Amino acid sequence: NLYFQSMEETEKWMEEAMHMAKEALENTEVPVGCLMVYNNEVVGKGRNEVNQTKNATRHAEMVAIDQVLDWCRQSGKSPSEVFEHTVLYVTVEPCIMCAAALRLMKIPLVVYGCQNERFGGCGSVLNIASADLPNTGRPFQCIPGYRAEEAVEMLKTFYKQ
Amino acid sequence: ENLYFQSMEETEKWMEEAMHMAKEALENTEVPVGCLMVYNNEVVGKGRNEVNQTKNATRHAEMVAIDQVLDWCRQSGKSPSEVFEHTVLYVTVEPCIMCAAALRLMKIPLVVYGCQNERFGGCGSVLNIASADLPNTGRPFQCIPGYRAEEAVEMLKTFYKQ
Ligand SMILES: [Zn+2]
Ligand SMILES: [Zn+2]
Numbered sequence: 148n149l150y151f152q153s154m155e156e157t158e159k160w161m162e163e164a165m166h167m168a169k170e171a172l173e174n175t176e177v178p179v180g181c182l183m184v185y186n187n188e189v190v191g192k193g194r195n196e197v198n199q200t201k202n203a204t205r206h207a208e209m210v211a212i213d214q215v216l217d218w219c220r221q222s223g224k225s226p227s228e229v230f231e232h233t234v235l236y237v238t239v240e241p242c243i244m245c246a247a248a249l250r251l252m253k254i255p256l257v258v259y260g261c262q263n264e265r266f267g268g269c270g271s272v273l274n275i276a277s278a279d280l281p282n283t284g285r286p287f288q289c290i291p292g293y294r295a296e297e298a299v300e301m302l303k304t305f306y307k308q
Numbered sequence: 309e310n311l312y313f314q315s316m317e318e319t320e321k322w323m324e325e326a327m328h329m330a331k332e333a334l335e336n337t338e339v340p341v342g343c344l345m346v347y348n349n350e351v352v353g354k355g356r357n358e359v360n361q362t363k364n365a366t367r368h369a370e371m372v373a374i375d376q377v378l379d380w381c382r383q384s385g386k387s388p389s390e391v392f393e394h395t396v397l398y399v400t401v402e403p404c405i406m407c408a409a410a411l412r413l414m415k416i417p418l419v420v421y422g423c424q425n426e427r428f429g430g431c432g433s434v435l436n437i438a439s440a441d442l443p444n445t446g447r448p449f450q451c452i453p454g455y456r457a458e459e460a461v462e463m464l465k466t467f468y469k470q
Binding site: 201202203204209212216225226227242243244247248251252253265266272273275280281282283284 | 363364365366371374378381387388389404405406409410413414415427428434435437442443444445446
């Protein structure tokens with residue numbers, strides 16, 4: 148019997164992701180913060196660590212997935228069991244790489260802020276999220292736009308440097 | 309600063325090794341994809357699919373290899389951008405949309421691959437991320453498909469009967 152996050156709890160999670168975006172901005176990373184909630188527990192967090200780590204794959208979303216995998220390791224739960232019922236709260240539309248990754252992990256729902264004009268994979272440049280692809284992952288659902296103005300303002304100021 | 313370029317025979321050599329790795333993947337109940345990454349005439353990363361062993365849907369052969377190259381960098385003192393930007397990837401199956409997006413972001417300049425990826429190919433089959441006009445996200449890269457495609461598709465086909 149799993150627990151479903153209400154609207155106010157969502158706004159609350161997206162608030163915490165924004166604070167993480169602010170932290171990333173200040174560490175000279177792309178301002179992207181994200182959270183993964185399962186059964187009313189925060190099961191993965193992540194900021195962009197591309198500059199720190201010097202590894203271009205390490206977007207907020209990827210850092211999160213590892214934390215959740217670590218979570219499963221320690222709870223004894225299986226990843227399929229967990230990811231299939233997990234909600235992602237991210238500051239920016241997941242890019243094509245992350246969107247293709249989230250399909251493969253089968254996260255059903257993603258709540259994001261602003262559009263990813265450069266490389267966004269939920270409609271901006273491609274819609275991998277809804278792609279009719281039979282034998283690869285599952286499609287997922289998006290609720291875009293939550294505090295987009297702020298998110299995009301961070302993104303913009305970051306792209307000057 | 310004088311970097312070494314792998315020849316045709318040397319490419320054929322690395323693809324044979326990627327083929328053996330794909331065999332090992334098959335026999336471990338993994339999607340049969342093996343790959344190598346070569347920098348300045350050195351094997352700087354290897355990888356097979358580990359999705360089942362690891363139970364993480366993103367650990368495609370290419371992602372295993374990238375982690376290994378990053379590990380090689382740590383120990384060689386060389387920077388990731390200086391290495392990946394001159395690394396050739398040798399793979400059994402066309403990189404998927406996820407991996408192709410990654411390879412753009414890592415800025416690997418050349419992928420040599422085997423058979424097509426009909427379900428999730430990102431070099432032309434389903435989408436062509438490799439050659440996409442995307443100004444401020446990674447670099448586009450080049451592909452040499454088809455090296456021993458027949459055997460590569462034969463392995464994949466045999467694998468999809470489970
Ligand atoms: Zn991303
Ligand atoms: Zn792949």
